[PDB]
Amino acid sequence: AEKEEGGDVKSVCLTLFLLALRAGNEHKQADELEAMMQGRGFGLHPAVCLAIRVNTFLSCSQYHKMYRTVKATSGRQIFQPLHTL
DNA sequence: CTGCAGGGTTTTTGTTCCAGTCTGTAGCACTGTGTAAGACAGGCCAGATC
């Protein structure tokens, strides 16, 4: 980092993973690593979520079911709650 | 000092191919929603005329 890139370790270390992983890999790798510091989501805009709802034919209780489930596990809730829809 | 020509430079950006590994799509034969009445013709028995 010192010889060629002055010494900014954060930028160096984050980049390191990609080639070792992506040498023989996933897709998952592109994703987990792509989430990082920039981003994000944050929240899927309520309109997009709404689209997913009425276009995949999700019942309000079924949808809310999904919301609760995705939110409790690893959440980081993605979907927007009912009242905002 | 300037102007641009045409070279130096590193550093993008991509290049050809062979093992594969993942991922999204087309190929499959094939499905869902059209859903109830009347009109016209002919026969013929009933039933009223008279």
Comparing CA positions, the residue from A45, A34, A54, A55 lying closest to residue A79 is A45
Nucleotide nearest A26, from its CA to each C1'? B22
Residue with the two structure tokens 């309109």: A47
C1' of nucleotide B23: residue with nearest CA: A27
Q: Evaluate the omega torsion of the peptide bond into residue A76 and state whether it is cis, within 30 degrees of 0.
A: yes
A5 touches strand B (CB under 7 A): no
Q: Which nucleotides of B are covered by protein (CB under 7 A)?
A: 22-24
**CA atom of A44 to C1′ atom of B2, Å:** 57
Which residue blocks in A7-75 are alpha helix, DSSP H? 9-22, 28-35, 46-56, 60-72
C-alpha distances (whole Å) from A54 to each of A33, A46, A50, A85 are 32, 12, 6, 11
Phi first, then psi: give them for residue A6, nearest 5 degrees: 60, -35
